[PDB]
């Protein structure tokens, strides 16, 4: 996934090093819990950034790209194995890639 | 190779006069030398190359007569300068912490 | 500095002896510079030669 | 060929080598210490470090792990060839040391525009060509490429 962000349009009013250094974050959420609680049974690859609104992507397949020791076990947990393992944050251009 | 070559060439000329490039920019009008502005990232590396060339102009007409002993002494002193500042590489887990909090 | 000169194992004009001494000397020198790569070999050589002359 | 570029590359390589043998002298100070001590008894003038430094195997504040003889000697011979390279480059360098032409060359630089290739191998291949552990996949042989 290739998520694009603002082009210095509104981020010009907020620059007080308040988690500004924090990159977008992804998490896998089960639909078992929703504001409406109607239907459910699949996962979502949620992606979040402070100002912008959350985003989700349905994952019917039980498992895809779930690799096996890709790198050589280096321990900077960041947030979780998922984020360090397979995400890139082009902060200079504001492009978040996830795979 | 192209970018490298143009950077290093405009750097070669820019190292002697600094007037030939400021004229070239107004004469041609090409998005090729867009690295001349400090905006373009590569610009920085440019500032390096030029400096380096500027340096070669320093001792032109002078030979370097460093001996083995001396070279060794120098390298030993350079290693001591790198060991002088060893209390500055212990600040990075902080950002991670922030991330964990927000997540 | 004097013993090897005034109390020689053998007569210093003996053939076998001088040949031996040559081979041994060569060995010791190569060993020396072999065990201390970092020191300028030419510097040492010239120093010794000038002391000799 | 613009001599400026050649002399530049030379000074740069010399810098690279100095940096390499300096990194070495850093990880295991013995490399220098050992050497220097011997030098002391050949050229009496030579100034040698504080004994404490020698013993604790430290250069400033950090005391480094003691290495075995075979490795010390190895790295010393490696540094030997490095210093040889350096002496050579220094030599050749000693022996080596408008607008219309600017546009003239910039024009020929347009040659072969379709050269799709990533070029990150000038300072990296050198830096790499002279660094610790340059032989194995990751960390098996201390010897540089």
3-state secondary structure chain D: CCHHHHHHHHHHHHHHHHHHHHHHHHHCCHHHHHHHHHHHCCCCCCCCCCHHHHHHCECCCCECCCCCHHHHHHHHHHHHHHHHHHHHHHHHHHHHCCHHHHHHHHHHCCCCCCCCCCCCCCHHHHHHHCCCCCCCCCCCCCCCC
Which among D23, D43, D94 has the least Cβ separation from residue B64? D94
Contact between chains at D115 and B2 (C-beta distance less than 8 A): yes
Q: What is the DSSP letter of A55?
A: B
Resolution (A): 5.9
Contact between chains at C37 and D77 (C-beta distance less than 8 A): yes
Q: Is B98 on the interface with A (CB under 8 A)?
A: yes
Rounded CA separation D105/D102 (Å): 5
B69 interaction partners in chain C (CB closer than 8 Å):
40, 43
Question: Experimental technique used?
Answer: cryo-EM
Q: Is D20 on the interface with C (CB under 8 A)?
A: no
Distance of CA D126 to CAs A28, D16, D122, D130, Å? 44, 7, 6, 6
Rounded CA separation A3/D46 (Å): 64
**Chain position carrying tokens 């409406």:** A36
Residue D28: other Cβ atoms inside 10 A: 19
Angle of the B2-14 helix axis to the D99-108 helix axis, nearest 10: 170
CB B64 within 8 A of CB D94: yes
Rounded CA separation A35/A28 (Å): 17
Distance separating the N- and C-terminal Cα atoms of chain B: 42
List of long-range contacts for B15-18, beta carbons under 8 Å, 24+ apart:
B15/B50, B15/B53, B15/B54, B15/B57, B15/D4, B16/B57, B16/D98, B17/D98
CB D126 within 8 A of CB D136: no
Which among D18, D103, D109 has the least Cβ separation from residue B5? D109
CATH number, domain B63-103, options 6.10.250.1320, 3.40.50.2000, 3.30.413.10, 3.40.50.300: 6.10.250.1320
C43 interaction partners in chain D (CB closer than 8 Å):
43
CB D51 within 8 A of CB D37: no
Minimum distance, in Å, between the CA of residue C9 and any CA atom of chain D: 27
**Chain position carrying tokens 């041994």:** C24
Contact between chains at D43 and C47 (C-beta distance less than 8 A): yes
Q: Which two tokens stand for residue D77?
A: 């011979």
Q: Where are the domains of chain B?
A: 1-24+37-62, 63-103
Q: What is the Cα gyration radius of chain A?
A: 16
B23: left (phi over 0), alpha (psi -120 to 50) or beta: alpha
Q: Please count the residues of chain D.
A: 145
Contacting subunits of D (3+ beta carbon pairs below 8 A): B, C
CATH architecture of B1-24+37-62: Orthogonal Bundle (1.10)
φ, ψ of residue C33 in degrees (nearest 5):
-65, -25
What is the spatial order of strands in the sheet that A2-4 belongs to?
A2-4, A95-98, A87-90
Q: Is D41 on the interface with C (CB under 8 A)?
A: no
Contact between chains at B83 and D2 (C-beta distance less than 8 A): no
What is the spatial order of strands in the sheet that A43-48 belongs to?
A25-30, A43-48, A58-59
Q: Which two tokens stand for residue B96?
A: 């991670």
Q: Pick the residue from chain B with its C-alpha nearest to C42.
A: B68
Minimum distance, in Å, between the CA of residue B70 and any CA atom of chain A: 41
């Amino acid at each position: 996934i290739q998520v694009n962000y603002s082009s210095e349009v509104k981020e010009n009013s907020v620059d007080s090093d308040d988690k500004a250094k924090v990159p977008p974050l992804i998490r896998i959420v089960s639909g078992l819990e929703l504001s409406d609680t109607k239907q459910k049974g699949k996962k979502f690859l949620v992606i979040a950034y402070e100002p912008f609104e959350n985003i989700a992507i349905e994952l019917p397949p039980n498992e895809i790209l779930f690799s096996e020791n890709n790198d050589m076990d280096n321990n900077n947990d960041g947030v979780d194995e998922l984020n360090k393992k397979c995400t890139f944050w082009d902060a200079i251009s504001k492009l978040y890639y996830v795979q | 190779r192209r970018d490298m070559e143009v950077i290093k060439l405009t750097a070669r000329y820019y190292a002697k006069d600094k007037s030939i490039v400021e004229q070239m920019i107004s004469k041609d009008g090409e998005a090729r030398l867009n690295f001349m502005n400090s905006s373009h990232p590569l610009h920085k590396t440019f500032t390096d190359f030029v400096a380096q060339y500027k340096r070669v102009y320093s001792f032109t007409g002078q030979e370097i007569k460093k001996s083995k002993r001396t070279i060794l002494d120098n390298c030993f002193e350079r290693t001591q300068y790198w060991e002088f500042e060893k209390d500055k590489d212990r600040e990075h887990d902080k950002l991670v912490e922030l991330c964990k909090i927000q997540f | 500095d004097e013993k090897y000169l005034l109390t020689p194992p053998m007569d210093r004009k003996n053939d076998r002896y001088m040949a031996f001494l040559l081979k041994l000397s060569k060995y010791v020198e190569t060993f020396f510079f072999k065990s201390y790569a970092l020191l300028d070999a030419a510097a040492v050589e010239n120093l010794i030669k000038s002391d000799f002359e | 060929m613009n001599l400026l570029e050649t002399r530049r590359s030379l000074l740069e390589e010399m810098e690279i080598i100095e940096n390499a043998i300096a990194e070495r002298i850093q990880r295991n100070p013995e490399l220098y210490y050992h050497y220097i001590q011997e030098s002391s008894k050949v050229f009496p003038d030579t100034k040698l470090p504080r004994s404490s430094l020698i013993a604790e195997n430290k250069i400033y504040k950090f005391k480094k792990v003691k290495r075995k003889r075979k490795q010390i000697i190895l790295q010393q011979h490696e540094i030997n060839i490095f210093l040889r390279d350096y002496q050579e480059k220094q030599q050749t360098f000693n022996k080596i040391n408008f607008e219309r032409k600017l546009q003239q060359l910039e024009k020929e630089l347009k040659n072969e525009d379709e050269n799709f290739e990533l070029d990150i191998n000038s300072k990296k291949d050198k830096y790499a060509l002279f660094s610790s552990s340059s032989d194995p996949s990751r960390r098996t042989n201390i010897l540089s490429d």
